[PDB]
Structures are given as C-alpha cells and as structure tokens.
Design a binder for this molecule. Structure first.
Ligand SMILES: CCCCCCCCCO[C@@H]1O[C@H](CO)[C@@H](O[C@H]2O[C@H](CO)[C@@H](O)[C@H](O)[C@H]2O)[C@H](O)[C@H]1O
Ligand SMILES: CCCCCCCCCO[C@@H]1O[C@H](CO)[C@@H](O[C@H]2O[C@H](CO)[C@@H](O)[C@H](O)[C@H]2O)[C@H](O)[C@H]1O
Ligand SMILES: CC(=O)N[C@@H]1[C@@H](O)[C@H](O[C@@H]2O[C@H](CO)[C@@H](O)[C@H](O)[C@H]2NC(C)=O)[C@@H](CO)O[C@H]1O
Ligand SMILES: CC(=O)N[C@@H]1[C@@H](O)[C@H](O[C@@H]2O[C@H](CO)[C@@H](O)[C@H](O)[C@H]2NC(C)=O)[C@@H](CO)O[C@H]1O
Ligand SMILES: OC[C@H]1O[C@H](O[C@H]2[C@H](O)[C@@H](O)[C@@H](O)O[C@@H]2CO)[C@H](O)[C@@H](O)[C@@H]1O
Ligand SMILES: OC[C@H]1O[C@H](O[C@H]2[C@H](O)[C@@H](O)[C@@H](O)O[C@@H]2CO)[C@H](O)[C@@H](O)[C@@H]1O
Lengths: 432, 432
C-alpha cells in the first residue's frame, strides 16, 4: 500500500499514454490470427511417432506444404494487420474517421516498403531484381516496428489535418458516402506525400529503406535488450508491480514489449519448421507458458494450496471457485478476491515467485536441459501441462520444466498463505 | 412517369440488395486513393513542352521512378483495400464485429493468393521461382473481382457462425478486449479452414489457383462486355432511367459495374506510363469526364442555357445557383430542384443527350479522332475543360470532344429548356 505515491502515479501515466495505448490495443487485432496460424503450424510439425507418414499416405508426399499456407497468411502478415489495427485505434481515439485512418496506414505502410526484391551474385557486386513484388518478409514480424512508426505518424498527421478543418466541403445535397470520401482526400493526399518524402530521403542515405534504418537503429539493438536475462526479469518485475497497483501489467508491458517478443518468437518459428536449431529463449510464449502459469503470480499453485491447505471458509471457497479460471491461466478472481492487489503480505510471493520462475526457466533452456519455444504462438490461456509440451514444438522436456516451476511456486506461496488462512479464520470467528 | 411501376420497384429493390451494397460501398474506400495515386501519375507523365527535361535537371534523369511510388501503393493495391471495405461493410450490415470481419477477409484474400511468382525463359522450360513474395499484380485491379467473392464468402460464413453463438465463452471479469478476441477465434478459424480448402481444390485443376479460375470464367468475359458499346449504353441508359425515379443511378450502376470499368482503366494505365497505345475506350473516366459533364446528363449545358436565356424569374435564379456546383459536376439542385426527376418533358433530353454523347465519343475515340483515357483516375468532380485535358494524359483531342459534346447537349436541351421556361412564366404571371 505504502510505496504507491511512487509507482502508481507513473503506472497511471503510462497506461493512459495514447501511443503505447494505440499500439498495445491495435496489436490485439493480430492475436486470434497468430493463433489460427499456429493450429496449422503445429498440426504439420507435431513429432508424433507414426505421424510424419500417417498423413503421407492419405494426402500424398507433400502433405506438409498445404499446412504452411495459413501460416503464410497470418505469421508473414502480422505487421500488415497490426498496421491497420494501430492506426484504426489511434483513429477512434482522436475521434476521426477510423475506417479511413486505418486504411490510410495500410496504404502508407505499403508506400513505405519497396515493391521489389533483389537477388545478388555472391561477392560480385551485380544482381537481378524482381519487381511488382511485395516482399513478404517486410510484412511479417520484422516490420511491426515500422508498422508502429508509420501508423502513428500517418494517423497523427491525419487527425491534425481534419481537426485543422483542412477539408473538402461537399454540398449537403450529395450522398453521405460522397461527403466522407472527399473529406479524407486532402488530409490523405498530404499524408501519403509526407511518408513518400520520408521514404525518398532514406532512399538517399546509407540504409536504403525505411524498414532498414528502423531495423538497424531500433528493431535490432532492442531485440537484443529484449532477449536479455535482465530483459525477461525487468519485464516480469514490471508486469507484477503493476498488478500490485491493481493494473493489468500483462497487457500494459505486453503491449510495449510484444513488438519484440513476437519478432523473437517468429525467428524461432522459422528455424523450427525447417528442422533447425531454435535460437531464442525469450519469446512471447516463454513467459506465457513457463512463468505466467496460473495467471500472474504462479497463481495456479496458490490456488491448489487453498484447495488443499486452506482451513478457513473464506479461502476454501475462493480456491473452490477459481481453479477453472486458473486452469486456463485467468486469475482476476484471485488477485482481486484474496485479495493480492495492494496486499503487503501476499504481494511478496506474488512478485518473487515469477522472478524465481523466470531465472530457473531461463537457464533450463540455455543449459539445454529443457527445450526452447518452437515459436508456434500458443495462446496465453492454455492448460498448464498441454501448454508446456506444445510450446516446445512437441518436446516433453518442456512439461518437466512446468511441473518443476509448479512445485517451486507451490512451496514459496504455501507458508505465506498459511499466514493468511490463519488471519482469516481469526476474523471468521469475529475476533476484532 | 407511368412506366414507373415497372422499373421503380426493380430499381429500389436492387439498391437494397445486401451484397451489391457491400460491394458498392466497399469500393468507395478505394476511391480517394486512386485520386491520390493519380495526382502523381499525371505529374510524371505530363506531355507539357519543356517539362520532362526540366524535372530531369532538378532531381535526376531518374525522377519518374519516385512518382511511381504513390502509384504502386494505391492502384496496385485496389483489391487489397477493397476486400477490407466490402467485408467490413457487409459486416457492419449484419451487425457483427466489422473490424474483425474486415481484417479477417483481408487475411483470407492473402491466403487465397499464392506467395510465389514464376518466371520462364521462353521455349526451354527453364524457370526461376521466387518464394516469400506477394504478387502485386494480384493486389491490383486484376484481383478486386475475387476481392468481392472472398469478402462476401468470408463475411457471410463469419456472421453465420457468430450468430449461431459458435463462440468462446470468456469469463465476465476478463477485460472486454480479451472478450472480443476469442469471440472471433472460432468463427475466424473455421473461416480460413474453409477458404484454405477452397484453394487446395483449385490447386488441383486446369486453373491451378483461385485468382485464375475467377479471372478466366468471370473477370475476362465480363471485361469485354464492359468495354463494349452496348456495355457503355445499356449501362448509361440504366443510370438515367434510374434517376428518372429519383435514385442515384450513377452510384447504383457504378458500384456494380466499376469492378470492370476500373480494370479497363488500370490496363489503360499499364500501357500509358510505358509509352504505349492505350487499349480500351471504355473506362471509369470515359463517362465522368466526357459524358456525365454537368452531372446527371450534360446538365451543365442545360444550366448554361438558364443563365443565358432565363425568361422566368425562377429558372433565372436556379441557374444563378447551380453553375457553381455544376462546374464541379454536382447537379442535385437541378435534377431535384426544377424537378427533371419525374417530369416527362425535361426527362426526354435528360435521357437522350447522354446516350447521344456516348456514341459521339465511343466513335470519336475509335476513329482515333480523340485520345483514349490515359487511365489516370481523375475524380468525377473535376471541372469540364481541364478534365478532358488531364483525362487523356495531356492530349488536346479531349478538351475538344468536350466542346463538341457540350455544344451538342446545349442544342438538344435548348428546345425543352424553352418549352419549360414558357410554362413557368405563365404560372408566374397568373395565366395559362
Ligand atoms: C480515404 C478514406 C475515405 C474512405 C471513406 C469510405 C466510407 O464509406 C461509408 O460507407 C457506408 C456504407 O457502406 C456509408 O453508410 C451510410 O449509409 C447511410 C445512408 O446512405 C448513411 O446515411 C449513413 O450515414 C451511413 O450509415 C458511410 O456513410 C460511408 O461513409
Ligand atoms: C479475428 C480477430 C478479431 C479480433 C478483434 C480485436 C479488437 O479489439 C478491440 O480493441 C478496442 C480498442 O482498440 C477495444 O476498445 C476498448 O477500449 C476501451 C478503453 O479505452 C475499453 O475499456 C472498452 O471496453 C473497449 O471498447 C475493444 O474492446 C476491443 O474489443
Ligand atoms: C487479449 C489479450 O490481451 N490477452 C492477454 C492478457 O489477457 C494476458 O494477461 C492475462 O489476462 C488474464 C485476464 O485478464 C489475467 O487473469 C492474467 O493474470 C493475465 N496474465 C498476467 C501475467 O497478468 C496477457 C498474457 O501474456 O497479455 C495479453 O496478451
Ligand atoms: C463517391 C461517389 O460515389 N462518386 C460518384 C458519384 O458522386 C457520381 O454521381 C454524381 O454525384 C453528384 C452528387 O450526388 C451528382 O450531382 C451527379 O449528378 C452525379 N452524376 C451522375 C451521372 O449521377 C457518379 C460518378 O461516376 O458515381 C459515383 O461513383
Ligand atoms: O555453472 C555451470 C552450469 O553450466 C553447465 O554447463 C553449461 C555451461 O555453464 C553453459 O555455458 C552452457 O552454455 O553450456 C553448458 C551446458 O551444455 C551445466 O550445464 C550446469 O549443470 C552448470 O550448473
Ligand atoms: O462511317 C465511316 C467512318 O469511318 C472512317 O474510317 C474508319 C472506319 O470506319 C473504321 O472501321 C475504323 O476502324 O477506321 C477508320 C477510322 O480511322 C472515318 O474514320 C470516319 O470519318 C467515318 O465517319
């Protein structure tokens, strides 16, 4: 409760920031997709004993290429969708035409990235080049850093222009569709012109693209801080001392760091679906499946410790009613019911348990004892045991990491919850 | 005024057809963009004396390449924009999640169009195959004819599932953003599973792909009817007998034809900026710039007449208050304001003059006497003389077709404009 005149005003200014908000929320537009694409991803890469052939007989030899189609349409397009989302949202926000702001930036994005791919002859400084081609790697996870930048730049200029009433003023008699279209025309024009001119500029620098300067000075070195151990710790430690103030750190931090956590995730995904070594430990589903187990503490453990050791009626019930939302990694019932939010005693293991589960989980995967995330974006709401297996692209070395973490949490919480249960049975006999 | 218990019910009912409406209004999203793209096009193609070289001196002998950037981000991205538009609208309609339905149909377009491009060295069956690319020829005009079939089919199925409550029931304490997503997760997944299959089928045919079967069976034949003289005369008649009932005929015919009218305008553009003879006569701007001159039916001519030969006190002040909007090709004040709309005097020239002007241009352009439309989509609101100039890519045989055309209307209207004015002074004196 006490150190809330230090964390909770800053936490409020961040969660209200319109730009991290616009990005954070707009990014949600991708989620159901990155999932749909993972059902196909992990139906074709599932390492079942008589599976690689099982499917071969029925379909054919290349039973595996079809199952790569949806993955193309979702995973290699993340930033395209994400660009609509973000602009559209920052659109709704500024009370401008959202449909417009969110298509303007679809267009703008494309304008920013070149419609051509160049093949080079190895160390010969000569080349051929395919044109009228949207490089489908500049759409994927490696571009949502420019998806942000340009969606935010476009929509921001776009709203400022309608708000400056710089607009085509169509006669009232003309249909309403007509009025809306021509309204946009002038801002729209000016926006593409700016982005265009921005391009031409980097078109004339060392880095030839927009995506390039942005990836060299931003996307790249930040992906580094991201897969850091300090990167995974400081994120997890922020994610929870936000919940502490009753905010949803998971989506708040998640919303800042996901442009990196799914870039890394994606890399792993590409390697995996080609029999290669999986490079990163820190992905999105790293935390989602090996740290955020019950929900936002290792809560699932705490909930089994109420359903097991809770003498009082107050908890024996809270744990009776919150294995379900817990089993699926949803925990509002606990953080807010126990409560854990703003609760001195319980807040201790609530912050500690995830760092201790991050450090552990982290190393297990480096030491190579425990598999890495395959990169299949399995959703944050996946039952603890099926989650670990499927997150390692079908590697049981991941199930044992969870059973391990589960056990670790179940013991760090236990003594803390005993101390609560006892405080609770006290006032439950109206003790004062 | 009597045969309007024959078409008045036919018209009205098509205007409320939910798919032709989704399409009609979805395409309006691509509009302002081609207007924007075209401003760049018609800059870097201006055949003005002492220009092509003047610019080359200031930026480089390679300047035309940059002004082809905005063009690629608009024109070559029609269908990609128009899938969102149609799917959204058609979703807005069914009162479902539009952002969803729209972002879903965009993902479904890209799923149905393959990320390979195949090149071939004639004769030798020698080839090179590029993976990881979106064929920009397919996001352009050549696609919007499947953009429809994919938005419609994808949205139709989508709302169906959502209405049957085939969704994921998330806990009520869980954030509303979390609730909206999984809500979509099942329908969305089923949706792609469908279209995906609809692909794997044609990837087993003489067609090989979706973009192909659709091109051959639908987009190619309907394209030739559209470029036909009848196709530019049944369509222009349809547009005016439809105003003869008070409905926006252009908007109706348009949003039902334009998937063809603006394929022809793209393939006039493909040629134009590669210095070739522009193939088709009939494009979107064939009508807007040479036929629909004042608005509904060379209305500008009939209006001019009122400013010149204004016997009555009313037609004199109607004219005084409708060349302003007439100049810009809006003519509501006239169609509805002196009631051409259901009146059977003014309706005679209202319907004829267009269908005249159409032939007196479809031949003027086949007889090579007048320049075909460059294919720069210049907006229908562009004033008369400049229109014929820019609409031809700077050729003057366009500024003349107008003059002859606007002259020609003036003398099919003048007799009626007189007859009417006659009536209006009588009933304004107190006579008969
Ligand atoms: C560059 C960005 C510009 C793109 C703009 C495209 C938007 O098109 C939109 O397409 C929609 C129907 O599909 C339009 O629906 C309307 O139809 C009703 C009756 O005509 C009307 O009175 C209502 O205000 C409205 O519900 C909408 O009014 C239009 O605005
Ligand atoms: C197939 C996939 C389709 C998935 C579509 C996902 C889109 O997510 C959507 O993204 C929107 C903001 O951008 C969300 O707007 C919210 O913002 C408010 C706070 O400012 C909040 O408190 C409101 O309850 C809520 O309306 C919306 O609640 C969410 O539902
Ligand atoms: C759609 C969406 O934004 N999903 C994710 C969040 O819901 C999720 O946070 C988790 O949400 C649950 C309900 O709101 C919470 O009970 C749960 O505690 C919470 N997880 C944490 C660590 O706080 C996270 C998952 O990483 O991010 C969003 O993407
Ligand atoms: C955005 C849009 O739908 N534009 C086009 C129409 O505006 C246009 O019709 C023209 O609109 C004006 C206002 O409603 C009218 O005054 C004018 O008479 C009218 N012209 C005709 C022939 O109806 C047409 C242009 O092709 O179709 C729409 O697409
Ligand atoms: O503190 C040593 C620690 O690591 C061991 O070996 C590791 C090594 O330390 C790492 O550098 C890693 O990258 O490679 C080795 C694993 O293959 C042991 O794995 C471990 O038991 C030991 O405690
Ligand atoms: O009625 C004759 C008409 O055509 C003339 O020559 C045309 C010809 O008719 C067409 O077949 C066309 O394809 O080629 C010619 C056009 O260059 C004249 O051009 C024309 O003046 C005349 O009215």
């Amino acid at each position: 409760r006490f150190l809330e005149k230090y964390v909770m005003p800053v936490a409020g200014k961040v969660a209200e920031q319109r730009h991290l908000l616009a990005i954070r929320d707009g990014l949600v537009l991708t989620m159901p997709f990155l999932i749909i694409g993972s059902i196909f991803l992990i139906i074709s890469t599932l390492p079942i004993p008589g599976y690689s052939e099982f499917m071969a007989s029925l379909f054919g030899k290349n039973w595996n290429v079809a199952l790569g189609y949806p993955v193309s349409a979702t995973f290699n397009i993340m930033a395209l969708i994400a660009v609509f989302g973000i602009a559209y949202r920052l659109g709704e926000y500024y009370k401008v035409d959202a449909l417009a702001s969110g298509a303007l930036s679809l267009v703008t994005f494309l304008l920013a990235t070149p419609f051509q791919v160049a093949y080079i002859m190895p160390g010969t400084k000569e080349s051929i080049l395919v044109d009228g081609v949207i490089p489908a790697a500049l759409m994927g996870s490696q571009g949502l850093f420019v998806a942000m930048i340009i969606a935010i730049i476009s929509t921001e200029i776009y709203r400022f222009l309608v708000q400056k009433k710089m607009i085509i003023k169509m006669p009232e008699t003309v249909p309403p569709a007509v009025t809306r279209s021509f309204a946009a025309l002038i801002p729209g024009f000016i926006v593409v012109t700016v982005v265009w001119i921005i391009r031409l500029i980097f078109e004339h620098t060392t880095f030839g693209s927009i995506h390039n300067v942005v990836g060299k000075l931003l996307q790249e070195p930040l992906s580094i801080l991201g897969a850091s151990l300090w990167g995974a710790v400081i994120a997890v430690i922020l994610v929870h001392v936000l919940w502490a103030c009753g905010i949803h750190g998971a989506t708040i931090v998640g919303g800042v760091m996901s442009p990196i956590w799914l870039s890394l995730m994606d890399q792993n995904r590409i390697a995996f679906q080609a029999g290669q070594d999986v490079p990163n430990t820190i992905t999105a589903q790293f935390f989602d499946l090996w740290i955020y187990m019950g929900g936002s503490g290792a809560t699932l453990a705490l909930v089994v410790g109420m359903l097991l050791f809770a003498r009082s009626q107050q908890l024996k019930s809270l744990g009776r009613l919150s294995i379900a939302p817990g089993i699926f990694n949803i925990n509002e019932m606990v953080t807010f019911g126990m409560p854990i939010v703003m609760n001195p005693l319980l807040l201790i293991p609530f912050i500690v348990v995830p760092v201790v589960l991050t450090i552990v989980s982290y190393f297990a995967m480096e030491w190579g004892l425990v598999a890495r995330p395959s990169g299949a974006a399995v959703t944050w709401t996946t039952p603890i045991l099926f989650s670990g297996y499927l997150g390692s692209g079908g590697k049981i070395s991941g199930v044992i990491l969870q059973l391990v973490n589960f056990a670790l949490a179940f013991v760090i919480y236990l003594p803390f919850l005993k101390i609560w249960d006892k405080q609770k049975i006290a006032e439950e006999k109206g003790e004062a």
